[PDB]
């Protein structure tokens, strides 16, 4: 999931 770029 989200950690950096995974995020936006």
Same mark, same amino acid.
């Given at each position: 999931? &989200?950690?950096?770029?995974? &995020?936006?």
């Amino acid at each position: 999931x &989200c950690f950096x770029k995974t &995020c936006x």
